[PDB]
Design a protein around this ligand. Structure first.
Ligand SMILES: [Ca+2]
Ligand SMILES: [Ca+2]
Ligand SMILES: [Mn+2]
Ligand code: NA
Ligand code: NA
Lengths: 676, 170
């Protein structure tokens, strides 16, 4: 990365820091050009301090010197080397050893903006240069008023600072109201008592300075947003066989369990898998019949899975462990990955293995010693009847890649473990779970005060507004807090039982009756849970969106680009599609009598996405592959949507496999002549 | 001694432009076998199977069954086995091995997936109950497929021209 940490003050006595930055060489200058975010009068630096180390490449005697020797004191391994004069003193330096450096600069009469200042050295062959790049390095800023040793002066963390990117340098400067609002950079605040305000493995300084794992989420580079991994298993397809074939696609959703109407408290990871209930082959009946499975047999299960990181930090040497579960609590299997033999890293917002590669098989075909996953007869009927699995993944994530100030590199540190860090994060942050991205539950944690901790007294205040902006990217383009074209009021706020009381009291105290009016006034505390959900959808107890009002569903199908005896072409919104398990096509006569075309619970999967983004609802697919034949132009073709919560997934107790009885929603109805 | 007659009628999308050929064939068989001793049943199948006319010898009911068949709009997959099942069930309930029973299936024999084998099995069940299975081919029907359902190639005729042949074989 860089060399010496530099602090520049507008006063003469180390009290008002205007710039904290580092420079790669002995050139410690800050020209006029780079002072754009400092008030004009404060652009006159009357003192500065620099701090770090040199490692030298050849042992030798050296003379240090600066541009302004009379204004400067310098120490090298705690001995004075310049002092109130060009005190020109040879000092021995051995190669490979590190020597502490401190330069002090005081200038009363500041006739110039910025600072022109260079640190030189001369070897014994009398060669004088500005100290070059691979000699100076930073002080060790690991767990001059800087209580938590992160490198950011206490005063700045508490009053607030801007981080400005130069050409190489990052500038860290105090927040001033009438200059930085206008320009669109954020006001950072952090705890002067906490090296990582979020209690995570990266310091406030590492975060805002980019001395951090390149794979940490960009939002988690804000010192109030926690950087930690969040991993679940996503199943893609399953294969079932008789043990001595049924192949089905699956969809999986990371889950969050409410209690009884209220957001939950646990920090576990879980996903629920839907097994596709649509037909694979034309005459198929019950899974059991297709297989030849009699009453005393066993079934075997195999599946492809990927790991999914929806957190804000990467994982390197240990995947979490997972129970494959049926029903409430019949573990079918433990899924372990070999420790310390990951083939890549598992990055935030990414998969393992990545999408450009084959997924993991629960039983790989090379591996004759992998554990078989079996089911008894009774359980296989359960699986057929519920078509559902759950994957419970623990929070064991392995070692952390942390920054190292003597290397300037990021490396996996074997003394650093996510197990030690996670509990601290959980304890000192508020949790928000938000589903606006594509209706998937995404979790974030924000540093917040425990009002009862006597040392938390100096942690930044966190409002609900700021938390949404910094953690999720809500913004206020034109007065209204929003997320990607969706107003905040299109989302519902739900809290755990205790948070709920706390919020309600805050509102009463504010005289507010409506949380949307006072988002900037509502204070977050540690250990709060907030669940934020798109208002258009119905949610099951896991908070998966499983449906929507009839009105919403009907509206989302208004735009019918093209209709014909082969089907419908429409623009349907990506979220709506996610909650429909299929469609039913029906022909109606003059007298109201009806006949479903695709008249089987397993024949509803007739809709598909196109590359242009549009949905095709394919009439041919279960019409022996032909367009519908409408013998009479006064007949209607009616098309119905079926929501997830309404899907039938097996034949009736009476063995009836039709669409008879299905709760369905009318979304299109035209006469033969109105279609063409 | 005389016959119980079971019509198993393909109303899938693949034969929709020929429903009228199928209807006509049924009407013209209903008009030949008018003896009061004879009973018929009409079954239709696409992706479900439905008894349009329960086995019966009443002339009014048959006539009503024909008007019903005339209203059929063919659409759907071709689950022939669900059609033969409904025939078999009615046969079973009729006395089984007791009756002289006959199934006539009208179809193009274009079957997908597991339907060929489930039709083959239902066909064999039919014969196990003392019934003969005939297949009348619609359009460019699959010869082999229908031979595997019907008793033999003797009981496999085209629709076009197979009224004559099929009445002499009775
Ligand atoms: Ca600090
Ligand atoms: Ca700090
Ligand atoms: Mn067909
Ligand atoms: Na790092
Ligand atoms: Na999981």
């Amino acid at each position: 990365s860089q060399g010496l940490l530099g602090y520049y003050f507008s006063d003469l006595n180390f009290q008002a820091p205007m710039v904290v930055t580092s420079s790669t060489t002995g050139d410690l200058s800050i020209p006029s050009s780079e002072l754009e975010n400092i008030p004009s009068e404060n652009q006159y630096f009357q003192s500065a301090i620099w701090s770090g180390f040199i490692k030298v490449k050849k042992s030798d005697e050296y003379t240090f010197a600066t541009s302004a020797d009379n204004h400067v004191t310098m120490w090298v391994d705690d001995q004075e080397v310049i002092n109130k004069a060009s005190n020109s003193n040879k000092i021995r330096l051995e190669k490979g050893r590190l020597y502490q450096i401190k330069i002090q600069y005081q200038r009363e009469n500041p006739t110039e903006k910025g600072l022109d200042f260079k640190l030189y050295w001369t070897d014994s062959q009398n060669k004088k240069e500005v100290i070059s790049s691979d000699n100076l390095q930073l002080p060790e800023l690991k767990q001059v008023p800087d209580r938590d040793n992160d490198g950011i002066p206490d005063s700045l963390e508490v009053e607030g600072y801007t981080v400005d990117v130069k050409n190489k340098r990052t500038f860290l400067s105090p927040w001033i109201s009438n200059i930085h609002e206008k320009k669109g950079l954020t006001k950072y605040k952090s705890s002067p008592e906490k090296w990582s305000t979020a209690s995570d493995p990266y310091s406030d300084f590492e975060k805002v300075t980019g001395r951090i794992d390149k794979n940490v989420s960009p939002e988690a580079r804000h010192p109030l947003v926690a950087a930690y991994p969040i991993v679940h298993v996503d199943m893609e397809n399953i294969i079932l066989s008789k043990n001595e074939t049924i192949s089905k696609n699956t969809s999986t959703s990371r889950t969050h369990t409410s209690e009884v109407v209220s957001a939950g408290f646990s920090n576990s990871n879980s996903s629920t898998v839907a097994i596709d209930h649509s037909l694979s082959l034309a005459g198929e009946r019950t899974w059991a019949e297709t297989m030849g499975l009699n009453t005393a047999d066993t079934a075997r299960l195999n599946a492809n899975i990927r790991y999914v990181n929806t957190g804000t930090a990467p994982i390197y040497n240990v995947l979490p462990t997972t129970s494959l579960v049926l029903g409430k609590n019949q573990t079918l299997a433990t899924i372990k990955a070999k420790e310390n033999q990951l083939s890549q890293i598992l990055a935030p917002n990414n998969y393992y293995p990545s999408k450009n590669l084959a997924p993991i098989a629960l039983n790989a075909q090379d591996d004759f010693s992998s554990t078989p996953i079996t089911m008894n007869y009774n359980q296989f009927l359960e699986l057929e009847k519920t078509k559902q699995l759950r994957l419970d993944t623990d929070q064991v994530y392995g070692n952390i890649a942390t920054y190292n100030f003597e290397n300037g590199r990021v490396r996996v540190d074997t003394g650093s473990n996510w197990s030690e860090v996670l509990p601290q994060i959980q304890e000192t942050t508020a949790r928000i779970i938000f589903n606006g991205k594509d209706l998937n539950l995404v979790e974030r944690r924000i540093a917040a005060v425990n009002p009862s901790d006597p040392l938390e007294t100096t942690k930044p205040d966190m409002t609900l507004k700021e938390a949404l902006k910094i953690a999720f990217g809500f913004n206020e383009p034109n007065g209204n807090l929003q997320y990607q074209g969706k107003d905040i009021t299109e989302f519902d706020f739900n809290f755990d039982q205790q948070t709920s009381q706390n919020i309600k009291n805050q509102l009463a105290e504010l005289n507010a009756t409506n949380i949307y009016t006072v988002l900037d006034k509502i204070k977050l505390n540690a250990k709060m849970n907030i669940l934020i959900r798109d208002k258009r959808f119905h949610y099951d107890r896991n908070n998966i969106a499983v449906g929507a009002d009839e009105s919403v569903v009907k509206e989302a199908h208004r735009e019918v680009i093209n209709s014909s005896t082969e089907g419908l072409l429409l623009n349907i919104d990506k979220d709506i599609r996610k909650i429909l398990s299929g469609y039913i096509v029906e022909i109606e006569d003059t007298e109201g009598l009806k006949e479903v075309i695709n008249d089987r619970y397993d024949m509803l999967n007739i809709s598909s996405l196109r590359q242009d983004g549009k949905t095709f609802i394919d009439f041919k697919k279960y019409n022996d592959k032909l367009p519908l034949y409408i013998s009479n132009p006064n007949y209607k073709v009616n098309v119905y949507a079926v929501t997830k919560e309404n899907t039938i997934i097996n034949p009736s107790e009476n063995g009836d496999t039709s669409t008879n009885g299905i709760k369905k929603i009318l979304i299109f109805s035209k006469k033969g002549y109105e279609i063409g | 001694r005389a016959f119980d007659l079971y019509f198993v009628l393909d109303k899938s999308g693949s034969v929709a432009n020929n429903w009228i050929e199928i209807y006509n064939f049924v009407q013209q068989l209903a008009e030949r076998f008018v003896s009061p001793e004879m009973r018929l049943s009409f079954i239709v199948f696409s992706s479900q199977a439905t008894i349009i006319l329960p086995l019966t010898g009443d002339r009014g009911k048959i006539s009503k069954g024909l008007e019903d068949l005339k209203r059929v709009s063919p659409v759907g997959e071709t689950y022939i086995h669900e059609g033969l099942k409904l025939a078999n069930e009615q046969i079973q309930k009729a006395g089984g091995l007791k009756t002289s029973s006959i199934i006539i299936a009208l179809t193009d024999g274009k079957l997908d997936g597991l339907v060929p084998s489930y039709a083959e099995k239902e066909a064999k069940i039919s014969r196990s109950l003392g019934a003969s299975v005939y297949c009348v081919g619609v359009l460019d029907f699959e010869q082999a497929q229908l031979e595997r359902i019907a008793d033999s190639k003797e009981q496999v005729f085209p629709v076009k021209g197979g009224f004559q042949a099929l009445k002499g074989i009775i």
